[PDB]
From Swiss-Prot:
Disease: Chung-Jansen syndrome: An autosomal dominant disorder characterized by developmental delay, intellectual disability, autistic features, anxiety, hypotonia, obesity, and dysmorphic features.
Residues of the full protein shown: 1315 to 1435 of 1821
Domain Bromo: 4-109
Distribution of this protein across tissues and organs: Expressed in myeloma and epidermoid carcinoma cell lines.
Protein name stated in the entry: PH-interacting protein
Classification of source organism: Eukaryota, Metazoa, Chordata, Craniata, Vertebrata
Source organism (scientific name): Homo sapiens
Residues with Phosphothreonine modification: 47
Length: 123
């Protein structure tokens, strides 16, 4: 049980996504971009990603580790910077704040998971 629990990341990521869903800054990133309505999005973005897809992928058990989840969430933010490159866009600003919040909170989820990993690999 809980010391170096290698499953704990799952619940912690579910909680973090819940917080993200609550932030007004996530509003543009909650659902896939409507690709039949916003035409050039796919001209610019190779692999769309959004927080509802991340939440569903976690709920389905299809993330092997919190590093996989982290990769998808990072893709949301890199996509925004590619599609909305301008520092004066308020949407650029939203993405930037929300990314900082995510990176702050995911930090301990990753180090705890890796700690656990190195513990059980050692013993
Ligand atoms: C097609 O992209 C659009 C279209 C309208 C508004 C808008 O910003 C709310 C965006 C940018 N959305 C993302 C997720 O990059």
């Amino acid at each position: 049980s809980m010391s170096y629990d290698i499953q704990a990341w799952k619940k912690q990521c579910e909680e973090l996504l819940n917080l993200i869903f609550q932030c007004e800054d996530s509003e543009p990133f909650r659902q896939p971009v409507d690709l039949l309505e916003y035409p050039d999005y796919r001209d610019i973005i190779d692999t769309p990603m959004d927080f509802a897809t991340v939440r569903e992928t976690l709920e389905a058990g299809n993330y092997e580790s919190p590093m996989e989840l982290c990769k998808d969430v990072r893709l949301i933010f890199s996509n925004s910077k590619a599609y909305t490159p301008s520092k004066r866009s308020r949407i650029y600003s939203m993405s930037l704040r929300l990314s900082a919040f995510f990176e702050e909170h995911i930090s301990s989820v990753l180090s705890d998971y890796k700690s656990a990993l190195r513990f059980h690999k050692r013993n």
